[PDB]
RNA sequence: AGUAGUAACAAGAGGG
RNA sequence: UAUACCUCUGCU
């Protein structure tokens, strides 16, 4: 090494090495390339920790602030507004579960709420409740020597996940997440006073952002996530051995002005001796709904839907009687998942900085604040959806809510599948963008990239829909371009 | 600022039913 | 209407709406259970890329070591580690030519460090594999254990305090064929209690001597585990942890490579984000200025596949020796140690596996050491096959791993190999129709190729690609791509005729850091501030990020405002503070006070910002220097937190020390284990260090230096300070005698 | 007292465990055992804190908390427990303990804490006394640069600052080293006096001084002012599309003010040259311009900076140019040339490396002091000529020695014997060489060298010995016994009418300002710097495109001479402006003459290059050069580049990374196979057809006859078929 | 059952 | 063997 001197050593072995070892640039054209294949199987089922569009609220007019008053007192206050309960009946069976336990759990809960005298409610460890919360379902830990000789002792099931097909409900769920509501779901804490002129500008723009984000349906889902995961985390830590009851509460302020407390249902925390950050707390989630589960039975694979009452619902025309369903299911979560659920408000930041960078980018060109023109006028609009008529556009407020929904759904349906899909499909998007900028993009192994993407589309409802969204996007880019040597790179 | 969308639900809300 | 967020990309360019493709508001992937499946995968995959090489059984360890280098040149595009020694040395020489005096200065700076560096320097670092206990321990703890066992045997050169002597002791300790270690074990005694006799678990320690293989294997062993919380990937992978022996040698080798990379424009390491971007901007500026108007320009957005698995320890020995040419042979052989140990490294196989019987309803844990002597009826088909391959490499409960590398082992020298390939692409070396330049940090690279025609680029790519293959660097064909110079990607920085923002990358850092009330308020506001500067966080969103941080901070620390109607464990005591306080605006948020922060405030610490508005008694209590909540640590560790983005660097924050600068309770799971006694060792060590600081206040700022005893130093100071207190000051004559009699009494007890 | 410390050490030595550790472990080894711990560094602190803050007793605290605060408070909350924290004598504690302390705990004196935490309170002092201006909206170009992040740092090394800190808080334990510099001594006196009798941890005082004193830097993207106090507030002053004007509290340093004054004047002079009436334009800008909110004219009245652009501004306002200085007791007065600064280290005869602020370029001084005067001619480390006269031979020789040292020759540096040390105010390194040679100049004159001269009446030479010789003399030396005026075109001259300062000879090195400059001028664009000039000029063409397109068709000579193109012209090289205008206008009239071929983008791209009297030359251009922040950039004639990029996907012209505006959607569907306005007297037709012969370079186009077709390497790897048109354009 | 996903959790260790 | 309890641990 001390006496080595170069003498065409690289060029020599470059000559020796096979010409199979090469990186052939195959020119990339988005008109040539295929759609991503989505897997086959049974349909993908809802896997959120709470109902989204299918939820239903009992509520009271109440001046109490976002986290004020005792949760179970507010729960009992919300129950007292509703009458016309019934003897519960199973209207849709959880195929893998003992469904009489789900019925007995509801009846035990409802009677224990009636009998409670205090701030918290711990349920008695009944046989039906013990089953629902997975009592004693961990195999007992022995030394290997003692159990070495057992026939069916194998290693834990370590297979890839079972593939599932893209159901229509996830697109439907996302549509509702992007909508406005009649209620301000998020309350913001105080700032210091605005002194700087840019601080006054900020706060003017913040006025637009706040109303748009707070009244969006996705923000209701944020506040449900933030409440549930906070309650489950705190109770998991303090009340480890108790089956503690956690009512599903949010609080909001109408656009009319009145403050309101809402009750979606209840959660029964199982035992929660959570050592590792992946360790599971089992819980039962009993949630109100008007949605008939039989219209999409595939959506509710894990749920046992009871029918618990009848509600007289008022409208502009006349009153309607509708049945009240209680979507019961066993479910689970961890310290890491709970922690991230408690921090779901950061979704607001992901949407709004993208929105604000869009507003600011135009403001640089126009050399004035384009905040008010964007929210008040409907001149500047971006493609955000497809109908049978075609590619529909929307205002900056719509984009804010759609991007917010995306970030909330990334949070609710987090997975390794989403991670891998998002990172690999980002390369394919940039290649399409490179072509659209007239920069002559080239791949080396395009098949391998496609496989790296498609490998991650296994079973998750949210990643299946995002894969579908890419295909819809690809087709939209193809039709705008069309055939030609000098085609239509500009959209519309 | 009141945000508004071009969309409706003529009869009732299944999430916030008037009862 | 079906809503589709990705249709925004029709009008908005992908780089301009790149935040919508980063799902970083959800919990990232975590491994459950063991990483034995992954460690075996890595070991098996690493050997498959080198499979046409030469096997030889090691004289000392008896481990089966695969040597791929100077082997058959690859005949396909699959990942290969058949690096050619002569081709590596040509590239490293080419680097020396292009930067005359770089190797000279880098070596000389490393030599100056070797002479000055103390053994203390190895206390600063992350978790390290402790051969003493066959587990991971903190850096300082694994050091003290390794020094203690060295001192119990015939190895006390490190007594001096300089690090190079500790490194000699490590090389001298391989000669021992009976290395003694004290392993701990549990005993079940019985003792009477008034009138029933209860069982009592106690912990004794048993002296065990090791074989010459046993110690040698353990010193070359590197621990393994699954990497958690990693974004952008479907499947988990294994990470590695170096041992105490190799650690000190790695420090100096990386320190050389650092000094090399510090003066290389083409290196992305070790500089920060903005400087990395400036470096990429310079090479684009440099490539356009040097080229002519007739020429083309393409940029490869580049990933190297199987980076660590195909970088070879024997090749690193070639680099280290060539970089140190003409320097003293002691210095060359010292830096050559780490590559040698890496070439003869062995990998621990982790926790093992868990088995499950459905009918009997039982579970059990087998160790990874049992994977040799165990029936394969238990395991599934893929797992079985891996155990069958791993048995051919298994040596005393650890799989041998001569070729390749693993994540967490080694840092900057691998980038110098990549940079030497980038340096080859100068016009004056190639002398043909194409030429290149770029930037590289580890596996990630951005290559800019210029030529006169499109086919010149294709020849330049193949020339770069095959030259990389000649030194065991494998460009990913599936993950990399090429386009005309104008856009590219690099470590998730996106260029579009200039760098654009990637705010969503930073979303996990928006939240309560969880250090304490004082530190988090400072960390939170600074995160908002730095993102306004570096990642285009607009003013309105930044205001809302303050608003949402205060919410998160108020709930997490249960420190809601004093005029709230909430009820927690803290509301009542904060309400009492609220009512008694005259100027409410002076109260910190942690004391139920209002948020003072807007955009302009973010760089001012909270206590500093509220100081003039505080009640004097509250301010006097808040910042009381004799308060029991603060842990008076060293100056080097004052106002530091730990953060991950790289590996895991420290985050310095600006904060006034108050009662809110507290520390949360320690983990207590060690109480149940055989290492329970480590807590008392620590308790005794801290009491000894606490008393030393009363005689040597300076020790908390600058670490003291001496081969003398702690007691003899404290004794010497007790006499001379008492001398000056009487000879000119406020102390009586009877007190001087009382102190010197105690020093005589202490000297009498050895 | 020091009584209880030795008493406790005896009590510790009584314990047989602690006496073993205290005796066995050395002082160097104590640093290792201090960090010995079971405790891992927490991987997920955000999760753990959320987990632990649900617990009753999550905080660890000193056992002495049990003696200070009560076990239970007024509402029955348990404040502390007796459970020891794993691995120490600290006890587990509720957050209610921290609250009880802050409301009912022992009060202490902390009034001088703002002196300990001075680095923090200085930030508030600058903000509290800061002044906000208006917010302008525009594309803010940000250069990634290394900049100071620690304002008010008293600049020392880490080791120098360590000695100062030791002296203040640990005075008894200072090592072998001592306070070397007078900076170190004066800082220590101030720190000792400010921090006296301040009850606070010395650990914290040591920490805050380490952060305050030592200079720290970071790579940040900065638009505008780069000085410490402006870097402090980047989050507040700049965003993606806005500039919040803001002056921090306190006064700007003279260093920052002199640097930014030079940049302001240079930019003002570069702008004025390309206008019709430079002196009126320069004067217009001088009265409107301000630096750090202070008007530019009162700065020029009080600031003594000597620089060519500043002196042209001083001369236009009738202010005395700082033309003079003193050295060795002689008044030097420059009558020709200019001083260009370059600090570099050079070796003496004693091998001593010393950093000299060496001057370069040809200069002329009329020197005059006590009893003798001279006329010096100097170059870079050169005594070209010195004609000296005086009342005495010693007075002449004393002046001669001063000039020989003032020349900075390699002769006199190599002739130094021994080390250079003089005084306790130490003087700058020019006086170290002077005072050395004033005492003894035996080797200086021997090593200087002699030259032969022609015997002129009145002149005589001076030999190394001291004799007057007629035909021999020391190299350069000969012995023998101011109003200004500025014309319309900014040329500064003397009473005789000789050139003193030229606008053409002003330094073209830009550099980024340390303090903010606001030219409140219609002659200048809204934002400072050259990237702004490109973006605003191309934005302006797109905004007023409908007006300027018809003005292009009908009366182009009024379009080309628009005043809005004048800033753009400063970025073009002086020599290139005419031929570029010649090329552009020829290319534009080809587009008019060859009917059918019309490219809106190509007009917009090249339009700013028209604004100059055009040359009749026939050179070809594949690009125009533009000087942007020192480096040359090349705007290509055919297609996109870094400087000009029409993006079809966005329908936007991108100028140096920033969108400059969308042109009309008409221009997307606007093309023809034939491309005029690329080559002078030629027409690009379509793809390269090999029937018309092998490829020719652009320099080889003169070979082709009238109407002959050929293939050409036009640019960017494209090969293209081109025909020479018969009749040429206007 | 349920969480989950290439391997785990569904309390572990002890009072033997 | 089962059923009650009791102690330690919740990143080690
Ligand atoms: Zn609050």
CSV table of C-alpha atoms and ligand atoms in Angstrom, one decimal, chain A residues 189, chain C residues 550-551 554-555 560-561 564 566, ligand 1:
chain,number,residue,atom,x,y,z
A,189,UNK,CA,-55.1,28.7,23.4
C,550,UNK,CA,-49.2,25.5,24.7
C,551,UNK,CA,-52.3,23.2,24.7
C,554,UNK,CA,-50.6,22.5,29.5
C,555,UNK,CA,-52.3,19.0,29.3
C,560,UNK,CA,-53.4,24.7,32.9
C,561,UNK,CA,-54.1,28.4,33.5
C,564,UNK,CA,-59.6,27.6,34.4
C,566,UNK,CA,-60.6,22.2,34.9
G,1,LIG,ZN1,-55.9,24.7,27.9
